[PDB]
Amino acid sequence: NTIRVFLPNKQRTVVNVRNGMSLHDCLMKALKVRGLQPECCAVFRLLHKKARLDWNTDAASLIGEELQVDFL
Amino acid sequence: MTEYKLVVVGAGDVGKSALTIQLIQNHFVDEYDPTIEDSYRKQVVIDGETCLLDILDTAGQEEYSAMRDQYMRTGEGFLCVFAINNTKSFEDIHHYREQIKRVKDSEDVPMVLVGNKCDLPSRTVDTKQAQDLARSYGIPFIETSAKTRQGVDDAFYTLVREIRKHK
Ligand SMILES: Nc1nc2c(ncn2[C@@H]2O[C@H](COP(=O)(O)OP(=O)(O)NP(=O)(O)O)[C@@H](O)[C@H]2O)c(=O)[nH]1
Ligand SMILES: [Mg+2]
Secondary structure, eight states: OEEEEEETTTEEEEEEOOTTOBHHHHHHHHHHHTTOOGGGEEEEEOOOOOEEEOTTSBGGGGTTOEEEEEEO | OOEEEEEEEOSTTSSHHHHHHHHHHSOOOOSOOOOSOEEEEEEEEETTEEEEEEEEEOOSSGGGHHHHHHHHTTOSEEEEEEETTOHHHHHTHHHHHHHHHHHTTOSOOOEEEEEEOTTSSSOOSOHHHHHHHHHHHTOOEEEOOTTTOTTHHHHHHHHHHHHHHTO
């Protein structure tokens, strides 16, 4: 149960989704470690025209998706 | 700005991601959190040159060795990491080195052998085994601890220096 996330500055991560975490909570560590914070970024679901997402979207609802996080 | 593609490889649980996060953020992740794939970029000064490190932290769990081999092939230099309390991860170094040589289709690739978790008690992989193994490949061996940060910059900077002399 993971989500592939493309990150600013040509970085990327795959995160494990534990039960009951929002996207904010789910990506906090991967962003913190790279000197970013969710506050000044937007997150998008990439389709199969990307869809902008609220950071409070539940991470378990995006299992198997690909996301982009980008500076605002 | 000069860019160096570094790849951190080794068996699961040896400390590949903890070492990388110490280089990037000077912070020690005491968590268990296995990697699928993580890439990092950080700007550093080495031997008086500003350069960009692009660090691919691979999955030790070889069930994800598809994503691993896909991004290795662009790497210019490899950290081959084992943990001093895991003999299997030490014997596995041979496997990861032959994988690097296969994915690079070359005998000549910059590499550094890293023995991590040197802070732990009851070490089982002794210093002379490790130095002997590094010697057998003609590569530097660096003892590290991501917990205390010992050896962390030395491991990555040595790699960059090995990449520069390979031109
Ligand atoms: N005492 C000590 N613990 C360490 C050290 N390095 C890593 N650890 C711990 O060992 C465990 C595994 O570390 P981690 O970096 O996740 O390993 P990995 O090689 O990235 N694993 P994977 O390949 O699955 O992603 C974690 O609990 C981590 O905190 C170290 O130098 N000393
Ligand atoms: Mg890891």
